[PDB]
Amino acid sequence: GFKVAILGAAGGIGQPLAMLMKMNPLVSVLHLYDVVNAPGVTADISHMDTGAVVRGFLGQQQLEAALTGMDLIIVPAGVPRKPGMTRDDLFKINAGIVKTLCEGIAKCCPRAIVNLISNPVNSTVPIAAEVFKKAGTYDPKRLLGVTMLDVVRANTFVAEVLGLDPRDVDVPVVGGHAGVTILPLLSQVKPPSSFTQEEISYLTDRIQNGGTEVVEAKAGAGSATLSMAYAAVKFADACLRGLRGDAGVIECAFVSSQVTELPFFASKVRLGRNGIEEVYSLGPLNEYERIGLEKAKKELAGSIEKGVSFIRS
Amino acid sequence: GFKVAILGAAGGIGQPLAMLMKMNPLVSVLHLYDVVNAPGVTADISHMDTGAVVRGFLGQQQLEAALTGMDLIIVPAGVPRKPGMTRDDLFKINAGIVKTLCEGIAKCCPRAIVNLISNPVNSTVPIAAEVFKKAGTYDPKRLLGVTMLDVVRANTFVAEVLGLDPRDVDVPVVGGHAGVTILPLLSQVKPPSSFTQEEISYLTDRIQNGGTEVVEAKAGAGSATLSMAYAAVKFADACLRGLRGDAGVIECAFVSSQVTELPFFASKVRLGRNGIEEVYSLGPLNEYERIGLEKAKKELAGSIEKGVSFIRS
């Protein structure tokens, strides 16, 4: 099996995520890390009678111990939005957080596959890339922004409109991980289907804003944590199956790419023994998607620069 | 596809338990009930691309809609381990909660299989039984106290000792769900093994105090949530496979039985189309376990009464 580290394992997303990884039969070793409550979460999880052995790590002084030897690093680390946040002062905190964790990764497990969930992903992935570049350990094939939740939402909402089982639907989602930056390619959905103009717009808008659906349901106090955990694990499991050597492991992720003029983009990627084995091109898009693509790119260009800038200064 | 309702889906145990049930293919419909935040959790969960369709229900006024039609009702509901307040006995509270929920269940889904997790199981189950008796819906084959986490811990701890993968270990646990009432039959362990008196001592002690172990670790402000959700789902899933018609579905559970003089006891049971298709006796016990059996029954008798008198008196 493989060794996995979850950074921020005691948070809202972290916990359900650690519970699910502890259940993954491909995980031999599981390191739960956080700046608080790591021991209590570890204790709880240690009782589950599954294959993976779990250990906890608390504080910066233990990050090295948590990271050393890991094959995959799942990073949902990030401070929540509470005191009337979005204050942008938030972004500085999260960017700061992704920064140190990446410094640790660059130092302790430079070859480990990295699944960055820390939001905003459109900026933190570039941040990570820059930090690794500055450390001389950047392998664009091993850094992935987890955009899986958008695909999960798309599959679910598309299935609902088509009256299908969500498990039998696959919706490619490209671009970025926030708002109009999220671009579901309905014209490339599986199984083959046709959508009315009405459905195409309803679906796209819904997928792009699925996040606030949950924030609304929680009176703006919280956001998706469970579905996020479920998605990150579905994605982590994919990376693990890739490291195992499985063929055709394909999923959408926000990665370093040349599929567009932008340095980082979300598209279909093939996961293998050394991370990303192939970044799939966007291919044919219809009018609606083209117009959406451009709007996505415009915002994405700025978000990337924002992250690249945060480090390069 | 089976219909499942989770009472108290917004809590520590409920949320991860709800996420895991959403993932269970045997679940066609999933109802998330609670007095607070049910909508938020539901929205979160509804985005998961799995078969189960999920609906939320908030407050007493919506409990009937949640229950109606359910095949299985998992009940983790109950107040948390408040660190400050040592113990003005949660009993009063939880017991109250259990009673109202059970009244609802007896009225809305009398034929539903029930998985009561509400602490303390040693009392809440007899309470539920007393609530259904008065309602005239009691079916001893349909009420089950979830002691699955005692088995999970045992497998883990025992496998640790044996240096095995907890997945290849089975340790039957009988008796009750608290302290010395939890009785791990180490002599019936699979694979056949031998333990030193020390290990037998350590294992029996640790399994009986598993919960405490976690509370201590979480700095008094919390108890096992994840491992409990994990064990509850494994147990719930067993029931569902039972409802499906599967053969050989055997699990330990605190149920109504005449395995001992007590009206309730945890032992192996076979789950069938109507819930418990048979309650198995304890089998072979060494002197150590027989002694343990006596202490178990001793403290268990009172617990059972403490719960029955909550309804009768």
- Cβ-Cβ contacts under 8 Å, B44 against chain A: 214, 217-218, 224-227
> For chain A, after which residues does the C atom lie more than 2.5 Å from the next written residue's N, i.e. where is it broken?
none
Q: Is B94 annotated as a binding residue?
A: yes
Q: Which residue ranges of A are tagged as binding site for NAD(+)?
A: 8-14, 34, 94, 117-119, 228
CA distance A50 to B169: 10
CB-CB under 8 Å, B47 with A227: yes
Say how many C-beta atoms besides its own lie within 10 A of residue A73's C-beta. 27
**With an 8 Å Cβ cutoff, is B140 touching chain A?**
no
CA distance B254 to B148: 9
Tokens (6 digits) for A233: 């694990």
Helix intervals (H) in chain A: 14-23, 38-46, 60-67, 89-108, 121-135, 148-162, 197-217, 226-244, 287-311
Say how many C-beta atoms besides its own lie within 10 A of residue A270's C-beta. 16
Tokens (6 digits) for B235: 């147990």
Classify each residue of B221-237 as buried b or exposed e, where b means 16 or more C-beta atoms within 10 Å of its C-beta: ebbbbbbbbbbbbbbbb
Identify residue B70 by its one-letter amino acid code.
Answer: M
CB-based burial label for A142 (10 Å; 0-12, 13-18, 19+): buried
CB B217 within 8 A of CB A39: yes
Phi, psi dihedrals of residue A145, rounded to the nearest 5°? -85, 125
Q: Give the closest of B48, B218, B230 to A40, CB-based.
A: B218
CA distance A281 to B98: 56
CA distance A135 to B183: 55
Asked if omega into B263 is within 30° of 0 (cis), the reply is no
CB-CB under 8 Å, B19 with A15: no
Residues in CB range of A264: below 8 A, 6 or more apart: A122, A125, A126, A129, A145, A254, A255, A256, A257, A300, A304
CB-CB under 8 Å, A165 with B219: no
Q: CA nearest B117: which of B263, B233, B291?
A: B233
Task: Please report how many Cα atoms fall inside a 13 Å half-sphere around the Cα of residue A280, on the Cβ side.
Answer: 20
The position carrying tokens 């819930």 is B275
**With an 8 Å Cβ cutoff, is A50 touching chain B?**
yes
**A180 secondary structure, DSSP code:** G
Q: Which residues of B are catalytic?
A: 177
CA distance B8 to B14: 6
Tokens (6 digits) for A276: 């990303």
Domain ranges of chain B: 1-146, 147-313
CA distance A205 to B311: 53
CB-based burial label for B295 (10 Å; 0-12, 13-18, 19+): middle
CA distance B9 to B128: 19
Tokens (6 digits) for A236: 């982590």
- Cβ-Cβ contacts under 8 Å, B51 against chain A: 165-167
CA distance A7 to A60: 11
Q: What three-state secondary structure class fits B292?
A: helix
Fold of A147-313: L-2-Hydroxyisocaproate Dehydrogenase; Chain A, domain 2 (3.90.110)
CA distance B243 to B238: 9
Classify each residue of A114-131 as buried b or exposed e, where b means 16 or more C-beta atoms within 10 Å of its C-beta: bbbbbbbbbbbbbbbbbb
Q: What three-state secondary structure class fits B89?
A: coil
**With an 8 Å Cβ cutoff, is A42 touching chain B?**
yes
> For chain B, after which residues does the C atom lie more than 2.5 Å from the next written residue's N, i.e. where is it broken?
none
How many Cβ contacts (< 8 angstroms) between chains A and B?
134
Asked if omega into B191 is within 30° of 0 (cis), the reply is yes
What is the chain B residue with the closest CA to A47?
Answer: B153
Tokens (6 digits) for A85: 């946040």
Q: CA nearest B255: which of B147, B99, B178, B97?
A: B147
The position carrying tokens 């799939």 is A280
CB-CB under 8 Å, A51 with B167: yes
CB-CB under 8 Å, B23 with A156: no
Fold of A1-146: Rossmann fold (3.40.50)
Beta strand extents in B99-217 (DSSP E only): 113-116, 143-145, 173-175, 182-184
Identify residue B155 by its one-letter amino acid code.
Answer: N
CB-CB under 8 Å, A226 with B41: yes
The position carrying tokens 């498990």 is A167
**With an 8 Å Cβ cutoff, is B149 touching chain A?**
yes
Dmax of chain A from CA atoms? 56
Q: Which residues pair with B184 in a beta bridge?
A: B173
Q: CA nearest A19: which of B228, B169, B75?
A: B228
CA distance B72 to A135: 54
